């Protein structure tokens, strides 16, 4: 069967599922951005932009 390091080559001639993979990666990146900000908001002290 395919080796572990080539699993994603099954997309090379499958434009739809290639789009589906790209969408999922875009979903994950935007979710990160959203989760990272929310964590930063929950931990940020805004009371002193000087020091």
């Amino acid at each position: 069967g395919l080796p572990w390091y080539r699993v994603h080559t099954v997309l090379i001639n499958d434009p739809g599922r290639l789009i589906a993979a790209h969408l999922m990666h875009t979903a994950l990146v935007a979710g990160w951005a959203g989760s990272m900000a929310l964590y930063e908001l929950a931990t940020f002290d805004p009371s002193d932009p000087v020091l």
Partner: protein
Amino acid sequence: QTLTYDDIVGTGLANKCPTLDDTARGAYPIDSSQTYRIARLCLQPTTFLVKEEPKNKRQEAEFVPTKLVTRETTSLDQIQGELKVNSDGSLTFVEEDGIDFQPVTVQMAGGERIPLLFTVKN
């Protein structure tokens, strides 16, 4: 005019003090040989300002505006007391009684809630 409870109820006007026409700029003469009294005193806060905690380095605290969260429950009213005429001529109001306190909670930026006893007791 002469409004009734049923006119006011639920409108928010019960928390408002009465007002005077723009044309009431007369004067009330004070007869030193007379004794006077406040029959109704109404206070209606419109803004609540809280001093911020100037960090250790400080420089100067400010009075920061705040958001009211406890609704139209803020006014002092039906307050009574005698208006004395002092002999230097001044007037002194001495509160006797009335609805002279309201608990109020305002909110600062960041979400800190600041309760206070808004009051003129004594």
